[PDB]
Design a protein around this ligand. Structure first.
Ligand SMILES: Nc1ncnc2c1ncn2[C@@H]1O[C@H](CSCC[C@H](N)C(=O)O)[C@@H](O)[C@H]1O
Ligand code: NA
Lengths: 265, 265
């Protein structure tokens, strides 16, 4: 009679919470999706081994089109878990799944876990100063998306930080690097010419948040665009004007150049 | 000899990640603070029991003034952990402590945990649509806070949702409720009359996120301002322009007035 939306956290199998693991262990059926994001520091086998339950992986279509014909039916006479990377209900379309549950006369509960939305706090940037968030999407055909560029503009204009998710191709396991994102932004800048993202723009790159050894780097685009940030996934952040405390952190912890203490504060 | 910043999560001791528990369990000394937020579903005893260590709780003064005199020394020749509610770096100034650690020659690591900042996803509001965040502080004498009012105005003009962190004075066991924040806001409206926060303003309240049965409510100030949302902690959210699916969720899950299903654009 119960559906549990359980988050898996950031990087590996140990990023699930104690509450999440215990609840998952008591469930008769355990489902999961890995198309919204991937746990790059682990594998399906390691997650299954930690939970002690076989995990049935669902595709994007399984969820968005058939959640009610695949997951909810079993939840009527059993305790069912639906696992997702990060924090449940963060992916835009997931909240709607709770409505589907209600409509089916199924109780659902949410077991939280760390999300990149909060983990980016490790960059030293104040959370309250983050503005609207966006995704740098992979272009294609006659479609050249530039929305994320206006998001940066509108945020930075108000002294706000911009969190940029990088596009991902789940199955093809193709991750967009911070370098690729920077390249695209430089190209959109060439068109819009709004003076929003240039070789002199300060940016922060966070890679493998959740691991014990994340890569946190900060610097001007002209110096970081070709820097190697390690294995994915990467997250790009274009900070608004910095509070001196944020800057000192970026310098001492993320290796930022002293220059930002005078230029970006 | 290293220092670990470990988050404990939203509501109780089980909201800590597995990673954090295993690491915390093997630390020589364990410190913690419970002044940046309220973990309404646990006790120091339960935490100590779960970790298998004795925890020396610190005050804001001990941390802000004597962190390097109290915690860092032990870290130079031992594995030390510093626990905090939620995520250690979110909406706190704990990030600056890492700089102190470094300047003291002490390496530090961060273990994230579910944070209220990402937990807002349970309100059905698209997490990416949130703008600048704000904090509703307690009035001090003749000094009355209003900044949080401008934040809502700026976000609303852009159609972005606003997250309002509510104040806390753990030493006085004072935890600002949503109701109280709602009234402080009406007062500001009567002073600025910007048309930002009135009795017809739609709002959302999340109380005790992290528990199995948190209080999620949405509606007009006039009908919610005197409603009981249960024990703290609470957060107040003033949505911007809603999407049809956000409205459907607020109505079906947060008991909002069925008339908000009618978006104005
Ligand atoms: N479980 C919870 N439910 C509702 N509000 C919460 C909450 N936990 C924290 N808050 C809100 O956030 C304030 C603490 S601010 C510190 C936040 C913390 N580092 C985190 O990561 O969540 C509280 O005063 C309250 O307004
Ligand atoms: Na945000």
């Amino acid at each position: 009679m119960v559906l549990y939306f359980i988050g898996l956290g950031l990087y590996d199998e140990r990023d699930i919470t104690v509450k999440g693991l215990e609840i998952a262990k008591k469930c008769d059926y355990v489902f999961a999706e890995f198309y919204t994001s991937l746990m790059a520091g682990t594998t399906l086998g390691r997650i299954q081994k930690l939970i002690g339950k076989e995990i049935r992986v669902l595709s994007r279509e399984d969820v968005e089109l058939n959640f009610e014909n695949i997951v909810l039916p079993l939840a009527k006479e059993n305790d069912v878990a639906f696992l997702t990377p990060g924090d449940p209900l963060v992916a835009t379309t997931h909240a709607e799944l709770r409505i589907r549950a209600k409509r089916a006369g199924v109780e659902s509960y949410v077991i939280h876990a760390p999300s990149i939305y909060s983990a980016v706090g490790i960059t030293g940037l104040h959370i309250y100063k983050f503005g609207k968030s966006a995704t740098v999407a992979y272009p294609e055909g006659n479609w050249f998306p530039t929305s994320y560029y206006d998001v940066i503009k509108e945020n930075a204009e108000r002294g706000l930080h911009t969190l940029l998710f990088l596009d991902i191709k789940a199955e093809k396991r193709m991750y967009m690097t911070a370098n690729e994102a920077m390249e695209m932004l430089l190209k959109v800048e060439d068109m819009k010419k709004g003076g929003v993202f240039t070789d002199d723009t300060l940016v922060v790159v966070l890679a493998r948040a959740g691991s014990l050894n994340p890569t946190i780097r900060a610097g001007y685009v002209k110096d970081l665009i070709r820097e190697d940030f390690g294995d994915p996934p990467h997250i790009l952040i274009v900070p608004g004007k910095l509070h001196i405390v944020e800057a000192e952190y970026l310098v001492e912890i993320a290796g930022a150049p002293r220059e930002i203490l005078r230029v970006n504060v």
